[PDB]
Structure formats: structure tokens, C-alpha cells
Design a protein around this ligand. Sequence first.
Ligand SMILES: Nc1cc(CSc2ncc[nH]2)c2nc(N)[nH]c(=O)c2c1
Ligand SMILES: Nc1cc(CSc2ncc[nH]2)c2nc(N)[nH]c(=O)c2c1
Ligand SMILES: [Zn+2]
Ligand SMILES: [Zn+2]
Lengths: 372, 372
Amino acid sequence: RPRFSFSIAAREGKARTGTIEMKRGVIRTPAFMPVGTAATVKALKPETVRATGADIILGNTYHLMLRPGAERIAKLGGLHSFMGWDRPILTDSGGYQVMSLSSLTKQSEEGVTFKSHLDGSRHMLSPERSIEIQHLLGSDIVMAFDECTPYPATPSRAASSMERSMRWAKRSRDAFDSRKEQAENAALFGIQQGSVFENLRQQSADALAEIGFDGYAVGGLAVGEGQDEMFRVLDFSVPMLPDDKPHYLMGVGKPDDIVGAVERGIDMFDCVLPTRSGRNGQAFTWDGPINIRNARFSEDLKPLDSECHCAVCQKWSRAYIHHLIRAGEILGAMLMTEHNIAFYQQLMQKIRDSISEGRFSQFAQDFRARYF
Amino acid sequence: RPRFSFSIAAREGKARTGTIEMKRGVIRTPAFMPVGTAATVKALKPETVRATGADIILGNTYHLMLRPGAERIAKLGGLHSFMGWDRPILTDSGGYQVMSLSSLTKQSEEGVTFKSHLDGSRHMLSPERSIEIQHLLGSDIVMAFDECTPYPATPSRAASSMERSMRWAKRSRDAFDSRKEQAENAALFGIQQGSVFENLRQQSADALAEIGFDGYAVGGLAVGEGQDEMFRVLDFSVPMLPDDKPHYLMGVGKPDDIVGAVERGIDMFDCVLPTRSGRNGQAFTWDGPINIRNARFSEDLKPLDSECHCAVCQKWSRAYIHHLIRAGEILGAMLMTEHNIAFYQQLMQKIRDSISEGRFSQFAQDFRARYF
Ligand SMILES: Nc1cc(CSc2ncc[nH]2)c2nc(N)[nH]c(=O)c2c1
Ligand SMILES: Nc1cc(CSc2ncc[nH]2)c2nc(N)[nH]c(=O)c2c1
Ligand SMILES: [Zn+2]
Ligand SMILES: [Zn+2]
């Protein structure tokens, strides 16, 4: 396979279905990427993640640079070898989680200095260092280092962050290109900013296309604006991005949000929602999510979902999983997580099939009627 | 297969190797039984437990009567169906864990009244109720309800508890026999008491043989007496039990203890040691246990054990597992537990092969030289 090749096989309105070919494998789009926090997809062996249908997973750069260390993972042979996942891996830049999870962050034009929420140590993440860490991890899809904008944001603050992010996008591109092995074996995605402002989103898209990237992410959404607002921003933002490259909506996982985002031109998704759902007891079903801990499931012999084809639904009952979760048993988390990730993959498969078959609009309608 | 059939294929000194045939399957002895606390073998799917070579698992009656409930598990179809393990299951009587984990225990000749360490509720466990709960669970090997003796124990207190236990052994036998389905499909094991006193152990064995059971357990050991003392008691106690029936040493799991116990005539074992080892970071190797959390394993690319054939040792490094455990990741517990249980099963296989081949003494010697 080539370093990177995105091909669109079918379309329906703004929706697209196709494939991304990379050295480590093929990624079917629209794609959902399970999240690996500390070099592990919570409570699942990599073989189990693949069994659910996942073609690619996301790796948390912020946690990895802290916990095991980027240089250490490189010395050990890279993230793929370290965790046992040999397919593509998309790594975020670490900038977002720096503002969310770290302490005493000092920002500047060079980058951001911060203290670890673990040992209390200090690090200086910049466009160059972020690109370098992702290289050390052996990432297949590298995310440009940006400055996310807090919601709500004023036009001037949103413009300032967006402009800085574009300057950082150019630095990320140059850093990526100067490293021969990375430029020849991995891909680089640029991230669009501009908050909820159309003119800013347009300026960001133009700057991003001018630099040139393998894919484009719509950043700055799913930050507390609500679905209607998010969809409204997607309506005008996605068409601004190059049509022939992948469109990635960062941090969006709710099933209805995914369906709506695909209808607006999004090709890639990721989310900790499935992995955290099996932490508090939420299991996705075609009839909406259910909290397995509720007393009504104590003697329910039916599987989590009536049509789900995952191993969990083939072998265990709601009653058993209800018991496991309430007992705080590890198997409960393993079972809940596997089902949820499988559910998401089945959702993506149904989306891909309906688009290929010219019946995606009908699918979206049927899905919502039942789910809500 | 028949309800119960123990056959000895080979012997070497006091050591034996053979099989126990039951309706749900064959159990190769000497056997090690992984422990299922709350209807689950900690961090492992039942298919994974079987993959390690386990022929039978132990179910914690005390926890099951509290957490999901005996009557509820029966309404749901039994423990086997509930947790997804279709092979034999040995269930303890619940008497031991009642004295160890419950509050305000009131003992009498009828049984024991106690308060749950969970909700603070109250229950009255007796020989009859214990036998009934194990029936409701659908247990294959039922343990008689006894009164364990605290270490150290005076001759009079040890005699009193032993005598009560024998009266309770008769009540357990009668309760088991009066329930047609249980008597025809399950087996009943009697438990020998008498602390460290030879005459008491002899009186217990005679009373037990007089009543008649499918197997005999040596109870009251591994309660703080030390290996030398435990071995000393086993030296005279095991020969007192019927030769043609299984000998089960309760709550003994250390590898060296298992080897020594087999040399003294023990056929069955169980222990939470493997499951708890992967909780604090202890991994068994043929060169002795290692604490994976230690800094020396941070960049160790070798598997947990150099010759172990488990999937964990085939796919992941010490470095990765070290990271997972220190990060508190669920996958760390899953991986550690699977390896440890596999290690124990490989230990039992090596013991069975060496006995069948008339080289068990040599194996015991070689194992100790390397392990210590
Ligand atoms: N919503 C959102 C989520 C993420 C993290 S990817 C993720 N989120 C949740 C789990 N994983 C984002 N990351 C970056 N770098 N920039 C963004 O604008 C941004 C926006
Ligand atoms: N040592 C020991 C362990 C156990 C529990 S089985 C178990 N122990 C640890 C995990 N599982 C015992 N149980 C009973 N009923 N009677 C005993 O004398 C006794 C002695
Ligand atoms: Zn399922
Ligand atoms: Zn192993």
C-alpha cells in the first residue's frame, strides 16, 4: 500500500464512504476510532478491538509523553509493537489535554509549558516537539499542534487563537517534512479552528489548504456548544475543506452526533464515550442507551442489545453484566466496553452500507425514530 | 459420563495422578482450581480460563449468597449458565468466609447467624442451608458445612470444633442425599478437621469414612502455621483418608506448597494467590516470582516467563505490563491474571506428567533448585 491514499467510492448529499490506504492497513470511512488512553484501549486486548471491526485506533499523546515516555516507547520499538496493535494509529497533538488535564500552563508563541498532573514535573510542548513525540510513538496519522479555543469565545479571541493555530500548522508541516522517515511513512492532518464564526472558519480552511495536508480536522467543537450549534457550524465549515481529503471531527462520539456529522461531510470520529460508558454502566442499544446498573436488569436474561452481533451479546445476559458492574468486577468493564465498541463499529458499518446503497437518509431517519 | 468416578492412573510414593469423571467433564489430577469470587474468575472470560488448561473452577458460596443471591442465580438458570462456564464447579460451604468476612457472627449447634459485610443484612447458614445454596447454584462438587478451627488452637477447643464439624458432616450428607436431583448429579466432599493434632485428625478421618463421601478435604491448614508445620500435619493426616477417593487441600496455592502437598498425597488445590498476584504486581516465573512494578522491568522486552506458553508471554513484554500495572490499567490485571493462571496450570501439567512417568521426585528437586 502507499503512504496515504483517500478514495471516495460513493456519495449521498454531503455524505461520503470510501477508504484510506496506508502502509499498516486500510481504513473504511466513515470510521470510528476507539481510544487508547495509556497505550491501551480500556479493558480490551488489541485482538478484541480488531474483532469488533475497528480499522484504526487513537493514541493519547499527552498521557504517553508523561506515563511511559515518548523516548522510552521509541527505545522499546514504537507504540504498535509496545501495545500489540499492528494497524494504523492516529495520535492527537497533546495540546488539548495539556489545557484540560495539566497544571500551571504557561502559553506563548513558541508553545506551552506545563506541569504533569501525575508527578508534578514540567515540559515544553511546541509544534516541533509534538510532531517529534508523535514520530517517536511511530504514529501513522500525525495531528498538527494547535491552540484550542474555549467556549464561549469572543470574535477577537477566536481570531487570535485561530491565527496562532495556523502559524503552528505551518510549523507542524515543516517539522513533519524535515523528518524523512516520518514524511515518507506517515500522514499529517491540519486542524481547522475559528470557534463558531464563519469568516474565521473560512480563513482557517484557506490557510490550511494553502499549506496542504493529507486530511483536515474540524477542531473547536463538542466543547459545550450543544448539538444544534455544532451542526450549524458544520453546515458551513465542512464545505470549506478540500473535498478530496478526509474530514475528521475531533472528540465527537454520541451516536446521533455521528449520524448528523456524516450527513454533513465528516469521514472520521473518535471518542472515549464507549470506554467511559462501560465505567458508569451505560450500554448502547438500537433503542437508545440503558444503564445496566438499574434494578430492572437484575433478572433480565436478554443480551445487552437484541440484534448486536458482538461476542458479549452472544454469550452473556443483562442480568449477569448488571451483577458484575454493581460488584465492581473487572469482567463487567471488559464486557461493557467490548459491546459498546462493537456497537459503534456496527453503526459505522450500517452508515457505510447505506451511503454506498443510496439509502443513508432513510437509515438516518429510521435510526433516530427507534433510538429516540 | 457418570455422576462421579475417580481413577488413579499412576503413582510415585504418596503422589497420584488420574482423573475424576463427572457429567460436566473430566478433571485431571493433581488439579488446580482457579477461584471465581463473585461468579467470575477475576479479569478473565471463561473461555480464557479454559484456554489456560483449567478443568474446573471454584465458586465462592459466601459472596454469591450475598451479592447476586442463591435463589436469584437459580431463577436465572444456575451458576454455569449465569457466568458462562459449562465445566465442573466446586463450591465451598461458605462457613470459612463467614467467620472471616462477615460481622457479628453468632454460633450454635444449629449453624451460624451473621451480618453481611455489604448491606449489613442478616442470614442463618447451617449444614442444611449451605447444602441448599450449593444446590441452587448448581454446584458439581458440594463441600460439607463445617466449623473451621482458628490457629493456634488448644486440644480441647480443636476437639470440640472437630466433633461439631463431624456432626455437621452427617447433617450435610443427609441433606445432600434427601435432594434427589443433587444426589444423582453432584458429588459431596467431607472435610477433615483436628488442627495440628494427630489423634483428632484420626478421629475425624474415621468419622468421615464412616459417613462416606465422594472426596475428602484436609481443612484447617494454611491458617498461619507455616509450611513445615503444614507438611508435618499432612504427613500423618493424608494417609488417614480413603486412598481410592480424591484428597483436597483447601486454600493452598504457593507453587512450592503445591509440589510438597502432591508429594504427600494431595490431588486438588485452589487459591486466590494467582488472581491477587496480578493485583499487586506479582508474576510467577520458573525462576521464582517477580514484582513487575519494580523499576528493573521498565525497558525489559522479555516476556513474563522465558518458557511459559501462555498468550500473554507470546504477545507482550515485561515493559508493557509494568507500564499497565503502574498506570492502574485494567488490561494490566487481565494480562497478569491470565499468565499466572496459565503458569499454575502448566505447573499441574508438569506434575501430572512427571508422576505418570515415574520422575516426580526429580521434577520436585529440579523445580525447587531453580525456583529458589
Ligand atoms: N472536541 C475536541 C476534542 C479534542 C481531543 S480528541 C478526543 N476528545 C475526546 C476524546 N478524544 C480536540 N483536540 C484537539 N487537539 N483540538 C481540538 O480542537 C479538540 C476538540
Ligand atoms: N485454608 C483454608 C481455606 C478455606 C477456603 S477455600 C480458599 N481459601 C483461599 C481461597 N479459597 C477453608 N474453607 C473451609 N470451609 N474450611 C477450611 O478449613 C479452610 C481452610
Ligand atoms: Zn453486543
Ligand atoms: Zn505466560
